[PDB]
Amino acid sequence: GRDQAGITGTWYNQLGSTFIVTAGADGALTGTYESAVGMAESRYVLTGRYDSAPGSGTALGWTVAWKNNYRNAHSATTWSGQYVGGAEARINTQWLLTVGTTEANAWKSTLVGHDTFTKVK
Amino acid sequence: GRDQAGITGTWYNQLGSTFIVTAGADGALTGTYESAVGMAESRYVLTGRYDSAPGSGTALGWTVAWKNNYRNAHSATTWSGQYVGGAEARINTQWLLTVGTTEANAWKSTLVGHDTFTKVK
Amino acid sequence: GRDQAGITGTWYNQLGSTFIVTAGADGALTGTYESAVGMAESRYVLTGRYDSAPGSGTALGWTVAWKNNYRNAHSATTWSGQYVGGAEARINTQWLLTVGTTEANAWKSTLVGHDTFTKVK
Amino acid sequence: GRDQAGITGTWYNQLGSTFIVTAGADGALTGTYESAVGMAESRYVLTGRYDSAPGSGTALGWTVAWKNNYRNAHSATTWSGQYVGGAEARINTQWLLTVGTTEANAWKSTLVGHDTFTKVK
Ligand SMILES: [N+]
Ligand SMILES: [N+]
Ligand SMILES: [N+]
Ligand SMILES: [N+]
């Protein structure tokens, strides 16, 4: 993949969170995510996909379900965005966080936000 | 997983699209997605995660990168939502679709929408 | 405005909420919104804008701050969408609900959802 | 309103755009928005609402329909967010931009993004 080498590795967001990803030649993303905010402790599995054949950014997305051996926040976040390489490489994303709720509370089950990931803290 | 059996199988959205998923005991989602709208032909790989231990819905998300052996739309969609079981089982989602763009066009790179998936067409 | 007459009046969403709007020739929307869900009782002021000169839908949006003489939920919702006329007229929207929070909690301050409004309940 | 004086005036986003707003004691926002990106030239009317009685930010939102005497982009943007006062005052927002489309293209009618407004450029 064009940006396979650029994506693989460790990324940090504006809040302190870290994620470590391997991009496969087949478009796969696999790794772990460690949050700095919210009901999250330690690492969580992440999986996703990217465009392996894009001047344009490389579109990608991934999911974390917020369950590991220390916490279950009954929720999942998806990040959708694009990787931009270079000396100031970035993964710029928007995200959706859905919490498991009763049907009566489903209208308020999904938060939206944005994260910018860089190679340095 | 509590809803592993409920999630695994074939789901249809309000637009005609189909997706087929296997939920693993470990929280993994793997399968294929076939769209009915947009720049999409045939099946695309999908991967995601769900809460394996939630009255509450089961939070989940998944990603499709819109590249296969017939099309490359240089884009990825993530769906975030919850599975609700029963006779009228549903996966209710919001989604984010990011297109790879130049930096100048990044402000207009992400679409948002919603899909409701059911077990019958 | 092309759809001024079509927009002006009373609309109902899928949850029971009601809103009453006047569309001005100048692109203004003014009216009241009464919710069926959440921390809301009675009517709230709404204001917005629409495209007065669009086969295409008419783009529009409006805001409600959730403060009236009975409740203050320290929050505001914006709806963005389009009006489609005809025998089955609809206003199809996505919405963002932001709650006032401390800076530490700002990452979780905005909910996202969707509402479909029709002329009949 | 607690933050009426703090909100009233001129704000600049990260892209260069400017908006000038008057906050009324009754929760009204009125003013003009001038974009730096997209199909926009000169000023457009904006209207919105804010929480006049919130440590917490002040929730607010507003709408711009992208029609003036120079351009009609057949679209409207809503911003939802919160005002935070102080020496580094900010209005932090998410936004939804809906374009008028045919029914067949409605699934791709709404863009999502974020803007941070400050009192200095
Ligand atoms: N965010
Ligand atoms: N949608
Ligand atoms: N919703
Ligand atoms: N954005």
Q: Where are the domains of chain A?
A: 4-118
C107 vs A: CB within 8 A:
yes
In A1-121 the beta strands, taken as DSSP E runs, fall at 9-12, 18-23, 28-34, 43-50, 58-67, 72-84, 90-99, 110-118
Please tell me the distance between residue A58's alpha carbon and the centre of ligand 2 in angstroms: 23
Number of C-beta neighbours around residue D71 at 10 A: 15
Distance from C-alpha of D48 to C-alpha of C85, rounded to nearest angstrom:
25
B residues 4..43 contacting A (CB < 8 A): 26-29
**Cβ-proximal residues to D50 (8 Å cutoff; 6+ apart), any chain:** C65, C76, D1, D3, D7, D23, D27, D29, D58, D59, D60, D61, D83
Residues of chain C immediately before an interruption (C to N > 2.5 Å): 54
Distance from C-alpha of D53 to C-alpha of C35, rounded to nearest angstrom:
20
Token pair for D58:
């002040």
Rounded to the nearest angstrom, the minimum Cα separation between D55 and chain B is 31
Token pair for A11:
């990324």
Ramachandran assignment for B84, one of left (phi > 0), alpha (psi -120 to 50 degrees), beta (any other): beta
Could you tell me if B38 and B64 are in contact, meaning their C-beta atoms sit under 8 angstroms apart? no
Token pair for C11:
């609309």
CATH number of this structure's domain A4-118: 2.40.128.30
- Decide if B111 and D113 are in contact by the 8 Å CB cutoff: no
Enumerate the residues of chain B whose CB falls inside 8 A of the CB of residue A19: none
The DSSP 8-state label assigned to residue C105 in this structure reads G
Residue to substitute from B2, B49, B50, interface A, most A β-carbons within 10 A: B49
- Decide if A96 and C112 are in contact by the 8 Å CB cutoff: yes
**Cβ-proximal residues to D87 (8 Å cutoff; 6+ apart), any chain:** none
User: Would strands D28-34 and B9-12 be described as parallel, antiparallel, or unpaired?
Assistant: unpaired
Q: Coil, strand, or helix at residue A96?
A: strand
Residues of chain A immediately before an interruption (C to N > 2.5 Å): 54
Could you tell me if D45 and D61 are in contact, meaning their C-beta atoms sit under 8 angstroms apart? no
Distance from C-alpha of B89 to C-alpha of A80, rounded to nearest angstrom:
26
**Cβ-proximal residues to B5 (8 Å cutoff; 6+ apart), any chain:** B23
Q: Residue B91 belongs to what H/E stretch?
A: strand B90-99
Given resolution (angstroms): 1.3
Alpha helix (H) residue ranges in chain D: 4-7
CA distances to A13, B89, C105, D51, D86 from D55, in Å: 25, 43, 11, 14, 11
Residue type, C96: L
